Amino acid sequence: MSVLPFLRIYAPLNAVLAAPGLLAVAALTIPDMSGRSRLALAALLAVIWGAYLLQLAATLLKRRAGVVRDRTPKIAIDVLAVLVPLAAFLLDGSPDWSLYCAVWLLKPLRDSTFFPVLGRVLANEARNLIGVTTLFGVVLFAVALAAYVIERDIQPEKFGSIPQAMWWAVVTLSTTGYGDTIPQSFAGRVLAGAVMMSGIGIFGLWAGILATGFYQEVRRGDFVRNWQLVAAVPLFQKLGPAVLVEIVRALRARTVPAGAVICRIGEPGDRMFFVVEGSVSVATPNPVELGPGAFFGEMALISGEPRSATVSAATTVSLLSLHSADFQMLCSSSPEIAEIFRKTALERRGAAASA
Amino acid sequence: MSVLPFLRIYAPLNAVLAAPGLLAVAALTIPDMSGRSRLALAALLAVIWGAYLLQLAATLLKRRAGVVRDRTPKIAIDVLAVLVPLAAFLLDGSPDWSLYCAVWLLKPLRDSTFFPVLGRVLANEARNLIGVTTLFGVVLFAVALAAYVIERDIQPEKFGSIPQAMWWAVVTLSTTGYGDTIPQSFAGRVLAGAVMMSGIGIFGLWAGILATGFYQEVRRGDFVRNWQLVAAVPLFQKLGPAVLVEIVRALRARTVPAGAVICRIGEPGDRMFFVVEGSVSVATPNPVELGPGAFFGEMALISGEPRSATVSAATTVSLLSLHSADFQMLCSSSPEIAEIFRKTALERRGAAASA
Amino acid sequence: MSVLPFLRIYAPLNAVLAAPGLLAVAALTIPDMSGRSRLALAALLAVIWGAYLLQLAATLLKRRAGVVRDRTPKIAIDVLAVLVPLAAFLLDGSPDWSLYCAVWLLKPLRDSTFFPVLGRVLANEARNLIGVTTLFGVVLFAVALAAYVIERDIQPEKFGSIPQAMWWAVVTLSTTGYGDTIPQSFAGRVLAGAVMMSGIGIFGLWAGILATGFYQEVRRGDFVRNWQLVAAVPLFQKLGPAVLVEIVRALRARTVPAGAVICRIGEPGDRMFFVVEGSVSVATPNPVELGPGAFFGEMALISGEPRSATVSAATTVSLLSLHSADFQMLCSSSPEIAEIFRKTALERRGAAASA
Amino acid sequence: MSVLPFLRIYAPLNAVLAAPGLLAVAALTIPDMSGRSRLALAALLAVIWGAYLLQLAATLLKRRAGVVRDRTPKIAIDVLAVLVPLAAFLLDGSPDWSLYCAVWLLKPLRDSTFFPVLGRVLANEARNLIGVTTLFGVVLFAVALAAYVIERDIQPEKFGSIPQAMWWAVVTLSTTGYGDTIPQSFAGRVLAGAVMMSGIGIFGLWAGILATGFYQEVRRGDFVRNWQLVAAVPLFQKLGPAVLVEIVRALRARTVPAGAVICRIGEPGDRMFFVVEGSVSVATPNPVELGPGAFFGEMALISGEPRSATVSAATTVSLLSLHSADFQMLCSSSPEIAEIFRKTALERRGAAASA
Ligand SMILES: [K+]
Ligand SMILES: [K+]
């Protein structure tokens, strides 16, 4: 609710082309298809093949910033990105070579920031997952077995064995209800009362495990990335030790691209920003283009008024952002700093129009 | 648990008539229907057409408070509210013109406060959504493909292709279990063990993303709306800087209409209110009708007793509300303020009966 | 994890008999049933009828504590508890009179504490529910309509109309997958990708609304009930103002019945209790039976050792309970109090064996 | 995200063999099976039978640490682990004796730490569960009955009775959608709009109850286990009373085995550890092998740089772990301690290479 995410977060074309490329598959997977578009898209693999391959050697030029780096992750796919299709071309003479389009599926995951964020936490809490995962199977066969006791007589063809019922168990447990094979008697139908009760409580916990400390990491992502952009601010030599931890939870940093809008004039003022790198377009008679290490919004927040200028992204600005309460928190936190922002709330009244 | 929401929050008839109006459709959508009610409700569109159209020009009289405003949202539908039916009337000579009742569906969303509250946060966290949304498709085709490996032999008609299985994937993943086409062999049935495990963990996170910071905004909605109604209180010149942030999290403001009940006598006392605008009906021999900027409940909360008066909404009062703990928090926070509320806990003992 | 809930929380037989009573119904609901047990359980209604009716007049003796009370809730069912069966007996001459066993279903809800706890919060946040509830219908017909566009041609019998598709919508949206009627074409199957994505995000929020502030009330239930049992403690004249709010979040009060066990000797010490009313059985050579207003566990918690005595519930004791951390929090909070609990950690070493 | 869990948390073979053992069952459960593997795995039961039985007497040698212990839980299964198969061998002459493989299912739960963690909390909050559990049945039959009103006429074979509809209720309520028997008329289809609305709100709460305070226990598990490993640190005589509670929430302790990696050189520095028992392999020219009661990472965290040494687990080290923010919190908390870690950030610059 408090950030301007822009400049094509889904940026690199190395990520983009997996999407159209994998859609190239399915037309091959269909009988009664004409040969025209059949191979027309077979070329398109050669495009992305050639394309990453065009990118590839530029990547293998790893003399860029070659001091200390760990690029086994980023490189691990680029290698097989072009090898597996190639060997797939020959040894699999039949068209099924295309079935090695399971390969590009990591290329999104190659430069997927937020995916290492995933795997980071699983190596702290999977202790729980396993204890639940076993317990999932505990309750699985504890319950899956109870049906073999019964309907083997009159449902051999469906419940004539154990894993036939283990199948129904997870489908009965995992919120699903396929609806191919269901009991007929009373007592087996009694038991389902506890099952959904169970699995919705189990995944009541288990899926809860994920977002539980995941959110900590994501709420932590807003700090580890953002104890940076702190000393750049010429004002933050005086902030107390315990002051920052209180604040940086809410502060997020994102970038705007050149030419974009930042805050349009007249809209209801509801946030202020901290600039640390780039330049803006403060729409005034004398445009007050503040460069790295600035801020704006106090004019509207102390007043509770609409915007005083159509600030637009003159350049690619690495931004921060902030709403009132947390700035009211700051204004409440120290009278030492509200002095200058009071002055700034008067300086920028004349300095917006003047130089 | 701590608020009196009244005075028709679902107030404007501009919102109301979409509901009965869209129910006008379906009778047209049915064969063997008599022409009587067929067109009788076709009039009802002309009503709401004429009705908003009656409202319309009053809205187009936007000389009301015409200083600085941003009404592209509110106006954007009112325009098409009457145009699309009109052009639909002619060019679509067949009755299908009624199928442009997809149009009024924004009219609720026109004056839907709490909907801009929705779209506000999606422009901060959709960074996550996309990284998950891709990852959803990662795990989709990563898994959806695994079945084409197998049942193409004996299920051409069901699993003779890829998207036929991508269909089963999300239905298998998204908690659903339609139950049209399911495997027959072992290994494909092995794989589903990880799928519900996955999708319930995925949406274990993904849907968790929404309420996660949504609640922050909603918990923030109780402040941005409510740093107002603060200076109006003649007592709050002394409240410390850090004091307010602690408090306003719990305080919500709502309005009661005239004639309604506020707190009935004899009921178990469990909350106190802050009045800031309007008037009440304090049921005493001399009704102590306190106007803008007052409060009541301390008589019962310090004592832990039932109500001392049937306070009823004499007028449309913009209210606040508060339970003990957070007032006990206040009584615990400063002895300076408990002095006067101690006195008030004696003044209103005589002043309730007297003038 | 920190409480001894005992003494039959599901206590009153006024609640108990709805369960066996409503099971009396179904045998009537079955053809080819013998008349023996048919009416044998028809008597059992007359039992519970007579039983509550036996209880009834004792309840109508409301001269007990008749000072100021609000018993429209508790009485509202007792009235109809016996009237509706009675009038049902005559005017419904056929056996269907039994179908007015929808009546007792409130009798559990009569003395269901934790149910007013439910309805309390819905009158603060249903503002959200409605805005979502409309939005549910927004997304309902926004999406439900999209299918009538398509399969009316080849699925008249299933998708020949709108509400026929509104049916499929919520079943498609609400996590269900019945599996009676599903599309055949591509584009309609494209759309479901957003639906489960939607409804799991919608109820990603909407059901989240409930537990969100519900938990606040339940976490608040541990205070409003428990600012009581505070002044009874002869030690708590010195606790700071801000000290209590920190503590009472964790403290829960429950009751143990006479004869029960409280803490068995030798088990790993992990909690301490505060007694405020009743008496115990501290298993020592001289049983140190401490009455109202006492505590125990510090002997094991400061030491981190097993139990020093088999404390058993000599009487019906209204208890409290506490784990270390929050007592370590207290020991960390003030050196003034750890003095006496240090002494108590030596007094009860000799005083447990001696008198 | 902040811990190195290693050394085979799923360690004891007493837990391991339930998994392969119970898979021994199903081949017996299948007709047209050859006798070869039929009994070949019947031996494998005799293995695990003999195996635990081999383990058994060693366990019955409970003279190890025989001072004060509570091993009714751990022993309770070991007894029946070998008895039930044995009596099952004889009295059940037919092969169905194998159906007493419901017995080993507790052996995982025998030494399942994190399972007593489960049952601990259910004895504090099941107050809620019951009030909801009744309420589940309230809403069950309140709604399940509504259908018998209607389709008994034209669906005797499906809705000719009450529990036939109670079946459809939970399946309709519990997110499932089996899809065997569904209404045909309008009004019964109207009602489902509230059902999924209900059950997703009900389990919106009910399953929420579990993770709610479960997480408290699990978040508490990181303290009760970890007020230990505190006094061992020779530096923590000066930490303030309120300081520790702030910290130990994040700190988790786990063990690494000998030979493993701890932090590899060159990787991005993102955490620091506290050693309290064992020894390491700090990869330097003079390996600075610090034994019980040490730490490392400050060199990278104050600098924000990659790793300064390939620390590898020389021995089985009981570890702690910590990220910056919470150490920045510590560096922010007291200047008294940053002095020595400043010095340590210079001592280990020379002392890493030197001795
Ligand atoms: K389902
Ligand atoms: K189904």
From D58's Cα to the closest Cα of chain C, the distance in A is 24
What the block records as the tokens of A13 is: 């074309």
Confirm or reject contact between C10 and chain D (CB < 8 A).
Answer: yes
Beta-carbon contacts of C61 under 8 Å, excluding residues fewer than 6 positions away, are none
For C253-322, the DSSP string reads -EEE-TT-EEE-TTSBP--BEEEEES--EE-SSS-----SSEEE-HHHHTTT-B-SS-EE-SS-EEE--B
D225 and D163 in a common domain:
yes
B105 and B117 in a common domain:
yes
Q: Ligand 2 centroid to A44 CA: how many Å?
A: 39
Measure CB to CB from residue A134 to each of D108, D177, D207 and give the nearest one: D108
Q: How far is CA B143 from the centre of its chain?
A: 37
How far is Cα B101 from Cα B45, in angstroms, rounded to an integer?
9
Q: Which residues of B touch C193 (CB under 8 A)?
A: 170
Q: What residues are paired with A306 via a beta bridge?
A: A268
The reply to whether residue B135 touches residue A115, judged by beta carbons under 8 angstroms, is: yes
Confirm or reject contact between D179 and chain B (CB < 8 A).
Answer: yes
Three-class SS of residue D92? coil
**Each residue of D198-231: b (16+ CB within 10 Å) or e?**
bbbbbbbbbbbbbbbbbbebbebbebeebeebee
B161 and B141 in a common domain:
yes
Query: H-helix or E-strand containing D254?
Result: strand D254-256
Q: Which residues of B touch A10 (CB under 8 A)?
A: 130
Beta-carbon contacts of B71 under 8 Å, excluding residues fewer than 6 positions away, are B62
Q: What residues are paired with D317 via a beta bridge?
A: D256
Which residue in this structure is represented by tokens 């071309």? A89
B181 and B138 in a common domain:
yes
The reply to whether residue D177 touches residue B176, judged by beta carbons under 8 angstroms, is: yes
What the block records as the tokens of D69 is: 């212990």
CATH of residue C93's domain is 1.20.120.540
Q: Ligand 2 centroid to A58 CA: how many Å?
A: 52
How far is Cα A246 from Cα D235, in angstroms, rounded to an integer?
27
- Spatial strand order in the sheet of C254-256: C254-256, C317-319, C273-277, C294-296
How far is Cα A309 from Cα B85, in angstroms, rounded to an integer?
40
How far is Cα D189 from Cα B29, in angstroms, rounded to an integer?
18
Confirm or reject contact between A175 and chain D (CB < 8 A).
Answer: yes
Which chains would you list as touching C if contact means 3+ CB atom pairs under 8 Å?
A: A, B, D
**Each residue of A41-59: b (16+ CB within 10 Å) or e?**
beebbebbbeebbebbeee
Dihedral sign of CA atoms A282, A286, A291, A294 in order: negative
How far is Cα D234 from Cα D236, in angstroms, rounded to an integer?
6
> Closest by alpha carbon to D102, among A162, A165, A149, A145?
A145
Q: How many CB pairs under 8 A join A and D?
A: 127
A136 and A86 in a common domain:
no
> How deeply is A240 buried, as exposed, middle or buried, from its count of CB atoms within 10 A (0-12, 13-18, 19+)?
exposed
Q: What residues are paired with D322 via a beta bridge?
A: D272
CA neighbours within 13 Å on the CB side: how many for B307? 22
The reply to whether residue B124 touches residue A25, judged by beta carbons under 8 angstroms, is: no
Beta-carbon contacts of A61 under 8 Å, excluding residues fewer than 6 positions away, are none
What the block records as the tokens of A183 is: 């009991």
> Domain limits at B204?
126-233
Confirm or reject contact between D32 and chain A (CB < 8 A).
Answer: no
How far is Cα D45 from Cα C118, in angstroms, rounded to an integer?
52
Q: Ligand 1 centroid to C172 CA: how many Å?
A: 9
> Residues, chain C, total?
355
Q: D267 to each of A14, B206, D47, how far by Cα in Å?
A: 24, 30, 46
Q: Which residues of C touch A177 (CB under 8 A)?
A: 176-177
Which chains would you list as touching A if contact means 3+ CB atom pairs under 8 Å?
A: B, C, D
Sequence-distant contacts of A25-34: CB under 8 A, at least 24 apart: A25/A98, A25/A101, A25/B162, A26/B161, A26/B162, A26/B163, A28/A95, A28/A98, A29/B148, A29/B160, A29/B161, A29/B162, A30/B161, A31/B160
B120 and B217 in a common domain:
no
Q: In chain B, what's the furthest Cα-to-Cα distance?
A: 92
Q: How far is CA D161 from the centre of its chain?
A: 43
For D96-152, the DSSP string reads GGGGGTTSTTHHHHHT-TTHHHHHHHHHHHHHHHHHHHHHHHHHHHHHHHHHHTTTT
Three-class SS of residue D32? coil
> Closest by alpha carbon to C151, among C111, C186, C103?
C186
Confirm or reject contact between A242 and chain B (CB < 8 A).
Answer: no
The reply to whether residue A179 touches residue C179, judged by beta carbons under 8 angstroms, is: yes
Residue pair C129/C206 in contact (Cβ under 8 Å)? The answer is yes
Ligand nearest to the CA of B179: 2
Q: Is D307 annotated as a binding residue?
A: yes
The reply to whether residue D177 touches residue B175, judged by beta carbons under 8 angstroms, is: no
Q: How far is CA A308 from the centre of its chain?
A: 34
Residue pair B147/B248 in contact (Cβ under 8 Å)? The answer is no
A171 and A75 in a common domain:
no
> Resolution for this model in angstroms, one decimal place?
5.6
For A80-105, the DSSP string reads HHHHHHHHHHHH--SGGGGGGTTSTT
Beta-carbon contacts of A31 under 8 Å, excluding residues fewer than 6 positions away, are B160
CB atoms closer than 10 angstroms to residue C147 = 25
Beta-carbon contacts of D201 under 8 Å, excluding residues fewer than 6 positions away, are C206, C207, C210
CA neighbours within 13 Å on the CB side: how many for B33? 15
Residue pair A172/A192 in contact (Cβ under 8 Å)? The answer is yes
Q: What is the DSSP letter of A209?
A: H
How far is Cα C345 from Cα C301, in angstroms, rounded to an integer?
10
The reply to whether residue D175 touches residue B175, judged by beta carbons under 8 angstroms, is: yes
Three-class SS of residue D12? coil
C108 and C95 in a common domain:
yes
What the block records as the tokens of C239 is: 């606790």
What the block records as the tokens of D239 is: 């930490």
Residue pair D323/A220 in contact (Cβ under 8 Å)? The answer is yes
Torsion angle defined by CA atoms of residues A75, A77, A81 and A84, in that order, rounded to the nearest 10 degrees: 120
Q: What residues are paired with C295 via a beta bridge?
A: C274
Confirm or reject contact between A90 and chain B (CB < 8 A).
Answer: no
Amino acid at position B262, single letter: I
Residue pair B321/B273 in contact (Cβ under 8 Å)? The answer is yes
Query: H-helix or E-strand containing D19?
Result: helix D18-23
Q: Ligand 1 centroid to B179 CA: how many Å?
A: 10
What the block records as the tokens of D213 is: 């305070």
The reply to whether residue A177 touches residue C175, judged by beta carbons under 8 angstroms, is: no
> How deeply is B219 buried, as exposed, middle or buried, from its count of CB atoms within 10 A (0-12, 13-18, 19+)?
middle
How far is Cα C106 from Cα D142, in angstroms, rounded to an integer?
10
End-to-end CA distance of chain D: 33
Q: In chain A, what's the furthest Cα-to-Cα distance?
A: 92
> Residues, chain D, total?
355
Query: H-helix or E-strand containing D319?
Result: strand D317-319
For D296-313, the DSSP string reads E-HHHHTTT-B-SS-EE-
What residues does the ion ligand 1 have nearby, CB within 5 Å?
A: A 177; B 177; C 177; D 177
Q: What's the 3-state SS for chain B?
A: CCCCCCCCCCCCHHHHCHHHHHHCCHHHHCCCCCHHHHHHHHHHHHHHHHHHHHHHHHHHCCCCCCCCCCCHHHHHHHHHHHHHHHHHHHHCCCHHHHHHCCCCCHHHHHCCCCCHHHHHHHHHHHHHHHHHHHHHHHHHHHHHHHHHCCCCCCCHHHHCCCHHHHHHHHHHHCCCCCCCCCCCCCHHHHHHHHHHHHHHHHHHHHHHHHHHHHHHHHHHHHHHCCCCCCCCCCCCCCCCHHHHHHHHCCCCCEEECCCCEEECCCCECCCEEEEEECCCEECCCCCCCCCCCEEECHHHHCCCCECCCCEECCCCEEECCECHHHHHHHHHHCHHHHHHHHHHHHHHHHHCCCC
Sequence-distant contacts of C12-15: CB under 8 A, at least 24 apart: C12/C111, C13/C51, C14/C52, C14/C55, C14/C107, C14/C110, C14/C111, C15/C107, C15/C108, C15/C110, C15/C111, C15/C112
How far is Cα C317 from Cα C293, in angstroms, rounded to an integer?
11
Three-class SS of residue A355? coil
Three-class SS of residue D274? strand
> Closest by alpha carbon to B341, among B332, B229, B291, B248?
B332
Q: What residues are paired with B268 via a beta bridge?
A: B306
Residue pair C307/D70 in contact (Cβ under 8 Å)? The answer is no
Q: What is the DSSP letter of D7?
A: S
Residue pair C234/C275 in contact (Cβ under 8 Å)? The answer is no
Q: Ligand 1 centroid to D320 CA: how many Å?
A: 43
What the block records as the tokens of B268 is: 């178990």
Ligand nearest to the CA of C174: 1
Confirm or reject contact between D141 and chain C (CB < 8 A).
Answer: yes
D93 and D135 in a common domain:
no
Confirm or reject contact between B178 and chain C (CB < 8 A).
Answer: yes
Pairing of strands C281-282, A273-277: unpaired
CATH of residue D170's domain is 1.10.287.70
B121 and B193 in a common domain:
no
- Spatial strand order in the sheet of A261-263: A261-263, A311-312, A281-282
Q: Give CA angle at A253 (A252, A256), nearest 5°.
A: 130
C33 and C111 in a common domain:
yes
Which bin fits B175, alpha (ψ -120 to 50), beta or left (φ > 0)?
Answer: left
Q: C58 to each of A238, C11, C75, C86, D12, how far by Cα in Å?
A: 73, 18, 12, 20, 62
How far is Cα D337 from Cα D301, in angstroms, rounded to an integer?
15
Confirm or reject contact between B177 and chain D (CB < 8 A).
Answer: yes
Q: Which residues of C touch D204 (CB under 8 A)?
A: 203, 206-211
Torsion angle defined by CA atoms of residues C201, C202, C207 and C213, in that order, rounded to the nearest 10 degrees: 90
> Closest by alpha carbon to B217, among A271, D216, A263?
A271
Q: How many CB pairs under 8 A join A and C?
A: 7
Confirm or reject contact between D270 and chain A (CB < 8 A).
Answer: yes
Q: Which residues of D touch B175 (CB under 8 A)?
A: 175
What the block records as the tokens of C142 is: 């926004």
D121 and D15 in a common domain:
yes
Residue pair D303/D309 in contact (Cβ under 8 Å)? The answer is no
Q: Which residues of B touch C120 (CB under 8 A)?
A: 1
Three-class SS of residue C162? coil
Beta-carbon contacts of B167 under 8 Å, excluding residues fewer than 6 positions away, are C189
Experimental method: cryo-EM
Q: Which residues of B touch A105 (CB under 8 A)?
A: 138, 141-142
